[PDB]
Symmetry: C2
């Protein structure tokens, strides 16, 4: 019927060259997997700590790189025009690097979370770059979860140097 | 005879509060363990790539923190006055964060290496912070290796907010 074709791994591109991304990004209409990530104060943050709220996961390789830096600036602004939603900027950057960027840029709407102590999130959310120079970093992706911990939108950006589809991510939140 | 007392873990301090650091830092007169770390160009760097040269390992929690930032600035200057030696600045910061600091500061003598894809180095070199908010980051430490891959100096800084003993590290290199 409306099933998905079998995948063993995902393939994105870095300046046109193929990159293997582990497993599969969560699909719309499926249960969001539990996660623990590290906040600005070095405390542990779970998915369950955002119950009753909608969640935008803006996953990227490094906040210290241009395209990822633009996505964080965009999502910070888009957070003002969305109802009952938390915007989480997720990467393998240490909490200190993430806070330094947000601090210097005055971006206070988004919530920065590090996978530095939680490499498993990259595996479970299907964003772990498996090969090439960017191995161990997160692929560029967007995962939108509803109030009920159900995935409502998912995007694994085909080319890593391209910004994510903001409008498509925000469209599922509008009722 | 001249043996060391049995340890199961090490204890450093963060603003006076005890912090458990895994295993044991390599001791002087012992073989240096192999390692693979990630350079500025995202390439893999081994210990064997510095054969015939003496090695200063300046291990710290984050280049995006003050005390660690000072140690990198100090070691960059001290590298000019030392014979046949490579100075390696090692941390869990991503290569992008390490290069951004070195670039902005104009520090070109030191060699930055990331443990981000190689969590095992922190275990083998006895610098892995096991508990508290800083878990997963490296403890502040100095490991000096000779040309023959033998450890000649070792220091696990007792208090994490204190700078390492530069003079003692550089003293073993002088013949």
């Amino acid at each position: 019927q409306g099933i998905d074709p079998f995948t063993m791994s995902q393939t994105v591109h870095f300046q046109g060259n193929p990159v293997t991304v582990a497993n599969s990004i969560p699909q719309a209409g499926s249960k969001a997997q539990t996660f623990t990530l590290v906040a600005k104060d070095l405390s542990d943050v779970t998915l369950g700590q955002f119950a009753g709220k909608r969640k935008v996961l803006n996953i990227f390789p490094s906040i210290d790189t241009g395209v990822s830096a633009a996505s964080v600036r965009k999502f910070n602004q888009l957070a003002t025009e969305i109802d009952n939603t938390v915007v989480l900027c997720i990467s393998a950057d240490l909490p200190f690097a993430q806070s330094r960027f947000c601090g210097a840029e005055g971006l206070n709407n988004v919530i920065t979370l590090s996978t530095f102590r939680n490499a498993e999130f990259l595996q479970a959310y299907g964003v772990a770059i498996a090969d090439g120079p960017l191995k161990g970093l997160a692929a560029r992706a967007v995962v939108v979860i509803d109030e009920n911990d159900n995935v409502i939108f998912s995007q694994l950006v085909d080319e890593i140097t391209t910004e994510p589809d903001y409008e498509a991510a925000l469209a599922v939140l509008k009722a």
